[PDB]
Design an enzyme around this catalytic site. Structure first.
Site, PDB file in Angstrom:
ATOM      1  N   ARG A 117      31.027  13.099 -54.164  1.00 33.23           N
ATOM      2  CA  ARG A 117      29.631  13.053 -53.680  1.00 33.23           C
ATOM      3  C   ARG A 117      28.830  14.357 -53.597  1.00 33.23           C
ATOM      4  NH1 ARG A 117      29.906   9.925 -48.214  1.00 33.23           N
ATOM      5  NH2 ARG A 117      32.155  10.472 -48.272  1.00 33.23           N
TER       6      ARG A 117
ATOM      7  N   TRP B 119      32.329  11.195 -63.825  1.00 29.13           N
ATOM      8  CA  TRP B 119      33.477  11.470 -64.678  1.00 29.13           C
ATOM      9  C   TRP B 119      34.735  11.144 -63.878  1.00 29.13           C
ATOM     10  CZ3 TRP B 119      29.776  15.317 -63.682  1.00 29.13           C
ATOM     11  CH2 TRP B 119      30.075  16.123 -62.569  1.00 29.13           C
TER      12      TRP B 119
ATOM     13  N   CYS C 203      33.937   7.789 -51.841  1.00 31.92           N
ATOM     14  CA  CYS C 203      33.750   8.665 -52.995  1.00 31.92           C
ATOM     15  C   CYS C 203      33.947  10.150 -52.694  1.00 31.92           C
ATOM     16  CB  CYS C 203      32.365   8.445 -53.608  1.00 31.92           C
ATOM     17  SG  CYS C 203      32.089   9.456 -55.044  1.00 31.92           S
TER      18      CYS C 203
ATOM     19  N   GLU D 141      43.093   9.356 -61.063  1.00 31.06           N
ATOM     20  CA  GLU D 141      42.768   7.948 -61.247  1.00 31.06           C
ATOM     21  C   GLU D 141      43.490   7.385 -62.458  1.00 31.06           C
ATOM     22  OE1 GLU D 141      38.488   6.839 -60.548  1.00 31.06           O
ATOM     23  OE2 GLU D 141      38.219   9.006 -60.784  1.00 31.06           O
TER      24      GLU D 141
HETATM   25  C1  HEM Z   1      30.573  12.785 -60.583  1.00 31.30           C
HETATM   26  C2  HEM Z   1      31.837  12.336 -60.750  1.00 31.30           C
HETATM   27  C3  HEM Z   1      32.508  11.449 -59.763  1.00 31.30           C
HETATM   28  C4  HEM Z   1      33.796  11.553 -59.357  1.00 31.30           C
HETATM   29  C5  HEM Z   1      34.763  12.611 -59.850  1.00 31.30           C
HETATM   30  C6  HEM Z   1      34.059  10.494 -58.448  1.00 31.30           C
HETATM   31  C7  HEM Z   1      35.294  10.290 -57.813  1.00 31.30           C
HETATM   32  C8  HEM Z   1      35.605   9.047 -57.240  1.00 31.30           C
HETATM   33  C9  HEM Z   1      36.936   8.545 -57.044  1.00 31.30           C
HETATM   34  C10 HEM Z   1      38.200   9.281 -57.457  1.00 31.30           C
HETATM   35  C11 HEM Z   1      36.852   7.322 -56.449  1.00 31.30           C
HETATM   36  C12 HEM Z   1      38.000   6.385 -56.071  1.00 31.30           C
HETATM   37  C13 HEM Z   1      38.069   5.302 -57.166  1.00 31.30           C
HETATM   38  C14 HEM Z   1      39.326   4.479 -57.139  1.00 31.30           C
HETATM   39  O1  HEM Z   1      40.335   4.835 -56.461  1.00 31.30           O
HETATM   40  O2  HEM Z   1      39.340   3.419 -57.822  1.00 31.30           O
HETATM   41  C15 HEM Z   1      35.465   7.073 -56.264  1.00 31.30           C
HETATM   42  C16 HEM Z   1      35.008   5.947 -55.638  1.00 31.30           C
HETATM   43  C17 HEM Z   1      33.652   5.687 -55.634  1.00 31.30           C
HETATM   44  N1  HEM Z   1      32.635   6.406 -56.178  1.00 31.30           N
HETATM   45 FE1  HEM Z   1      32.701   8.115 -56.992  1.00 31.30          FE
HETATM   46  N2  HEM Z   1      32.958   9.747 -58.295  1.00 31.30           N
HETATM   47  C18 HEM Z   1      31.962  10.274 -59.038  1.00 31.30           C
HETATM   48  C19 HEM Z   1      30.667   9.810 -59.233  1.00 31.30           C
HETATM   49  C20 HEM Z   1      30.127   8.684 -58.625  1.00 31.30           C
HETATM   50  C21 HEM Z   1      28.848   8.151 -58.857  1.00 31.30           C
HETATM   51  C22 HEM Z   1      27.853   8.680 -59.873  1.00 31.30           C
HETATM   52  C23 HEM Z   1      28.670   7.072 -57.991  1.00 31.30           C
HETATM   53  C24 HEM Z   1      27.480   6.185 -57.903  1.00 31.30           C
HETATM   54  C25 HEM Z   1      26.208   6.544 -58.208  1.00 31.30           C
HETATM   55  C26 HEM Z   1      29.893   6.937 -57.253  1.00 31.30           C
HETATM   56  C27 HEM Z   1      30.167   5.998 -56.270  1.00 31.30           C
HETATM   57  C28 HEM Z   1      31.496   5.712 -55.917  1.00 31.30           C
HETATM   58  C29 HEM Z   1      31.824   4.461 -55.208  1.00 31.30           C
HETATM   59  C30 HEM Z   1      30.863   3.405 -54.758  1.00 31.30           C
HETATM   60  C31 HEM Z   1      33.159   4.439 -55.031  1.00 31.30           C
HETATM   61  C32 HEM Z   1      33.988   3.366 -54.329  1.00 31.30           C
HETATM   62  C33 HEM Z   1      34.275   2.150 -55.217  1.00 31.30           C
HETATM   63  C34 HEM Z   1      35.051   1.050 -54.515  1.00 31.30           C
HETATM   64  O3  HEM Z   1      34.951   0.804 -53.284  1.00 31.30           O
HETATM   65  O4  HEM Z   1      35.815   0.348 -55.206  1.00 31.30           O
HETATM   66  N3  HEM Z   1      30.724   7.957 -57.650  1.00 31.30           N
HETATM   67  N4  HEM Z   1      34.704   8.143 -56.737  1.00 31.30           N
HETATM   68  N1  LIG Z   2      34.405  -5.440 -57.102  1.00 30.60           N
HETATM   69  C1  LIG Z   2      35.523  -5.920 -56.735  1.00 30.60           C
HETATM   70  N2  LIG Z   2      36.627  -5.563 -57.407  1.00 30.60           N
HETATM   71  C2  LIG Z   2      37.476  -4.619 -56.922  1.00 30.60           C
HETATM   72  C3  LIG Z   2      38.577  -5.004 -56.155  1.00 30.60           C
HETATM   73  C4  LIG Z   2      39.449  -4.050 -55.643  1.00 30.60           C
HETATM   74  C5  LIG Z   2      39.219  -2.704 -55.913  1.00 30.60           C
HETATM   75  C6  LIG Z   2      38.130  -2.311 -56.692  1.00 30.60           C
HETATM   76  O1  LIG Z   2      37.931  -0.975 -56.937  1.00 30.60           O
HETATM   77  C7  LIG Z   2      37.633  -0.448 -58.234  1.00 30.60           C
HETATM   78  C8  LIG Z   2      37.329   1.043 -58.072  1.00 30.60           C
HETATM   79  O2  LIG Z   2      37.030   1.688 -59.313  1.00 30.60           O
HETATM   80  C9  LIG Z   2      36.299   2.846 -59.237  1.00 30.60           C
HETATM   81  C10 LIG Z   2      35.204   2.848 -58.374  1.00 30.60           C
HETATM   82  C11 LIG Z   2      34.411   3.988 -58.239  1.00 30.60           C
HETATM   83  C12 LIG Z   2      34.723   5.137 -58.963  1.00 30.60           C
HETATM   84  C13 LIG Z   2      35.806   5.154 -59.862  1.00 30.60           C
HETATM   85  N3  LIG Z   2      36.124   6.275 -60.584  1.00 30.60           N
HETATM   86  C14 LIG Z   2      35.220   7.113 -61.112  1.00 30.60           C
HETATM   87  N4  LIG Z   2      35.449   8.352 -61.362  1.00 30.60           N
HETATM   88  C15 LIG Z   2      33.892   6.541 -61.349  1.00 30.60           C
HETATM   89  C16 LIG Z   2      33.406   5.355 -61.902  1.00 30.60           C
HETATM   90  C17 LIG Z   2      32.019   5.297 -61.777  1.00 30.60           C
HETATM   91  C18 LIG Z   2      31.404   6.373 -61.118  1.00 30.60           C
HETATM   92  S1  LIG Z   2      32.640   7.491 -60.649  1.00 30.60           S
HETATM   93  C19 LIG Z   2      36.596   3.996 -59.988  1.00 30.60           C
HETATM   94  C20 LIG Z   2      37.254  -3.268 -57.193  1.00 30.60           C
HETATM   95  C21 LIG Z   2      35.586  -6.868 -55.566  1.00 30.60           C
HETATM   96  C22 LIG Z   2      35.055  -8.134 -55.315  1.00 30.60           C
HETATM   97  C23 LIG Z   2      35.382  -8.629 -54.041  1.00 30.60           C
HETATM   98  C24 LIG Z   2      36.171  -7.802 -53.235  1.00 30.60           C
HETATM   99  S2  LIG Z   2      36.479  -6.370 -54.162  1.00 30.60           S
HETATM  100 CL   LIG Z   3      39.537   3.484 -63.672  1.00 32.49          CL
END
Ligand code: HEM
Ligand SMILES: N=C(Nc1cccc(OCCOc2cccc(NC(=N)c3cccs3)c2)c1)c1cccs1
Ligand SMILES: [Cl-]
Ligand code: HEM
Ligand SMILES: N=C(Nc1cccc(OCCOc2cccc(NC(=N)c3cccs3)c2)c1)c1cccs1
Ligand SMILES: C[C@H](O)[C@H](O)[C@H]1CNc2nc(N)[nH]c(=O)c2N1
Ligand SMILES: C[C@H](O)[C@H](O)[C@H]1CNc2nc(N)[nH]c(=O)c2N1
Ligand SMILES: [Cl-]
Lengths: 362, 362
Positions: free
Chosen positions: A68, A237, A65, A242
């Site tokens: 953060r 947000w 993320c 993205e």
């Molecule tokens: C405040 C605005 C935020 C921005 C701009 C932001 C930005 C991002 C971006 C650009 C990604 C990559 C997502 C992707 O490529 O699909 C990401 C991943 C992530 N963000 Fe954030 N984020 C924010 C808030 C949060 C919040 C509130 C949380 C949780 C409380 C969070 C937890 C995560 C997690 C867990 C991932 C990785 C998801 C994965 O492995 O698929 N983020 N964030």
């Molecule tokens: N959960 C799964 N699905 C999956 C698979 C591959 C990629 C994957 O990523 C989706 C990421 O989408 C996100 C995650 C975090 C943040 C964001 N973007 C945002 N700005 C936010 C969304 C919520 C808080 S910030 C988008 C999700 C999996 C199950 C088993 C292996 S992966």
């Molecule tokens: Cl998305």
């Protein structure tokens, strides 16, 4: 062994959490109380404070993320009280309303009862609370291909999409004791959407592109002190890339680059013209301009990396190790124009944290 | 132990090399001959064939290289015969001429005598045979900052640059037995340079940008079957992004993005305008257009990734494991528009290969 893993995670979490909260002297008696409750019950219940700070820590430890910096401002809604699907539905609805906040998005998480013996109380099927359906039939492709399998499963259950490219999926989740999930259509008044226009190029509206305001990840497990909150949807947000560089650009998503090139008046015939790169820049400009014109929160990748740099400095100031996943932190356009690209990151997993879990469909 | 490491690497290399060359039946007697020569001499001499195929294998195993499809067409010049600095100089000069090939660049490596007891026969100081000098004095910055320390060292030795932003560094190298390196000014007739113009925007020439035609990495060690060729300069042609997205774009290199934005008529004031991204696209377009107009080989990042995809398929077809460094293979602009971004790579080190070595200055 399950109980031993629980206890170990609990003592690590409670000491680190109470230390950050200036509550170090209470660790001893709190850990005593926990050891008994584990003994007596097989688990333990977090206090309001532990729960809030745990969710915030989990965000701070999320290696992938870039957003953060703002970890400590997370708005934590404690919904451990729910027992009915009507309560779950209303909780999800409320989360959408309060997080959207009329466009001035509030990073929010709603936390539902945790697993017990690894038995889920509530199992959410959506990947995000708000996402578009996707269909693929006999050569014909409509909507968002990333949503094809969940869409097919919803339609198994008697939901029917209109088959526009932007059908809102219903909320779909299952309750402990139920064999099938339920689905509820999203009230359109809850869902903010943004039409994509370009600040200079009027034809850009001919693409009839739009996206939803608030990405609310609803399928990840929050883990805090050995307790598994499998249902704990959260949002921030969007970072513009993205939407503009992935959701609308990828060939396996909306695949709009050739159409973008056409409306901006460039040929899409030669790799050496860098028409993809150019279409990417204009599409990404359009997305930021559109969210800003509407008054819906968004951040560009340069600003976001500058915030993340502040997050890194803040971690050092506080004495905390920084962890990160370089491959996910770099933005998908102009990554080398951000400082992220030019350093490396320790990809160790620290808890609390958010984890992937198996999808109940597929 | 040194000799044991040598023998082990030798037997691994000879078996794999002879196998690829359909020469499997000769491994046994060749390995015998090697074991004796190691016994008798402390080392062993590669045959012409082993040397050529080894250099090619080393390219094929280079995890960070996107241009590896063409590994088998490498032109290997065997200069293990040199003993004088005049011969070294003339070898380097020849390498520049033959590789440049009037613009139709030929991937080439010149191989000099290898280390003996880790004692270098020839020690090349240049990072590339052709690179621009860099100066930093009292706030004043001229040329290429990546070249500041080698430039300072050349000027220690009595070379003096003209202090343009594009001073060609002299060739500089040291011979076994010599306390100081020697330097030789590059004949300008050997060095092809390309002025950077833009296909549509006439003002772009006001930047007075240029770059050299052929990047010839001259400071890496080639390792083949336990023998260390520390002096073995090699070249391909450029991928446009190396120049347009890094050498001319990085703040710690030529830092041209703000000047680019100005000549293309956009404001460089707001992150949300994505002016860096836009300047990157135009600068990168200009670079490809300029090399192509002049008749100097170059490849764009999309074409290069498509070639690399062919390299991956070819490796599978041949039964070879593929290795790669994702962080280096993705291009620095529009990486997610290439297939590379969307898969992962095993970053294991396989030999033969090219390795970094300590710089004799600094
Ligand atoms: C405040 C605005 C935020 C921005 C701009 C932001 C930005 C991002 C971006 C650009 C990604 C990559 C997502 C992707 O490529 O699909 C990401 C991943 C992530 N963000 Fe954030 N984020 C924010 C808030 C949060 C919040 C509130 C949380 C949780 C409380 C969070 C937890 C995560 C997690 C867990 C991932 C990785 C998801 C994965 O492995 O698929 N983020 N964030
Ligand atoms: N959960 C799964 N699905 C999956 C698979 C591959 C990629 C994957 O990523 C989706 C990421 O989408 C996100 C995650 C975090 C943040 C964001 N973007 C945002 N700005 C936010 C969304 C919520 C808080 S910030 C988008 C999700 C999996 C199950 C088993 C292996 S992966
Ligand atoms: Cl998305
Ligand atoms: C045929 C044209 C070639 C192209 C287009 C190409 C492309 C590239 C690119 C873009 C990089 C990244 C460089 C950087 O970011 O600084 C690279 C790295 C590399 N290439 Fe190639 N390459 C080619 C030929 C060769 C040849 C002929 C060899 C050796 C025989 C080679 C070995 C390598 C190595 C060792 C690296 C990594 C250098 C390091 O770690 O610093 N390449 N290549
Ligand atoms: N197209 C090209 N680009 C290219 C290919 C390979 C390398 C390259 O330059 C990369 C320079 O990378 C570094 C980065 C950091 C330090 C160094 N210097 C050193 N050799 C080190 C010494 C100790 C640690 S690193 C080199 C550019 C080619 C040139 C030659 C054949 S293809
Ligand atoms: C820290 C990071 O690994 C480093 O900045 C790398 C990133 N990827 C790269 N990729 C290429 N092709 N060239 C580089 O110089 C770098 N730098
Ligand atoms: C294989 C590779 O790790 C994968 O495609 C990753 C690359 N980096 C990413 N980075 C972000 N932010 N989001 C993604 O979906 C991906 N995909
Ligand atoms: Cl270079």
């Amino acid at each position: 062994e399950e109980k031993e893993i629980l206890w170990n995670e609990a003592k690590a979490f409670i000491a680190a959490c109470y230390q950050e909260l200036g509550k170090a002297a209470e660790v001893k008696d709190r850990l005593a109380d926990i050891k008994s409750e584990i003994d007596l019950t097989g688990s333990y219940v977090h206090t309001k404070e532990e729960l809030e700070h745990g969710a915030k820590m989990a965000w701070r430890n999320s290696n992938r993320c870039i957003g953060r910096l703002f970890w400590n401002s997370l708005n934590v809604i404690d919904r451990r009280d729910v027992r009915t699907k009507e309560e779950v539905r209303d909780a999800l609805f409320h989360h959408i309303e309060t997080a959207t906040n009329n466009g001035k998005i509030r990073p929010t998480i709603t936390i539902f009862p945790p697993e017990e013996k690894g038995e889920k109380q509530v199992e959410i099927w959506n990947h995000q609370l708000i996402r578009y359906a996707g269909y693929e039939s006999d050569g014909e492709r409509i909507g968002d291909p990333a949503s094809c399998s969940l869409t097919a499963a919803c339609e198994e259950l008697g939901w029917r999409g209109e088959r526009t490219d932007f059908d809102l999926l219903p909320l779909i989740f299952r309750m402990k004791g139920d064999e099938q999930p339920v689905w509820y259509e999203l009230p359109r008044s809850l869902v903010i959407e943004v039409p994509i226009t370009h600040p200079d190029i009027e034809a850009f509206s001919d693409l009839e592109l739009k996206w939803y305001g608030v990405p609310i990840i609803s399928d990840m497990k929050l883990e805090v002190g050995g307790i598994h909150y499998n249902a704990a949807p959260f949002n921030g947000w969007y970072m513009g890339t993205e939407i503009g560089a992935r959701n609308l650009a990828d060939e396996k998503r909306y695949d709009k680059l050739k159409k973008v090139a056409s409306v901006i008046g460039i040929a899409a015939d030669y790799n050496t013209d860098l028409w993809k790169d150019q279409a990417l820049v204009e599409l990404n400009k359009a997305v930021l301009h559109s969210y800003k014109k509407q008054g819906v929160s968004i951040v560009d990748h340069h600003t976001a990396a500058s915030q993340f740099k502040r997050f890194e400095e803040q971690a050092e100031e506080a004495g905390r190790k920084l962890t990160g996943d370089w491959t996910w932190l770099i933005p998908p356009i102009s990554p080398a124009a951000t400082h992220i690209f030019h350093r490396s990151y320790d990809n160790s997993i620290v808890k609390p944290n958010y984890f992937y879990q198996d999808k109940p469909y597929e």
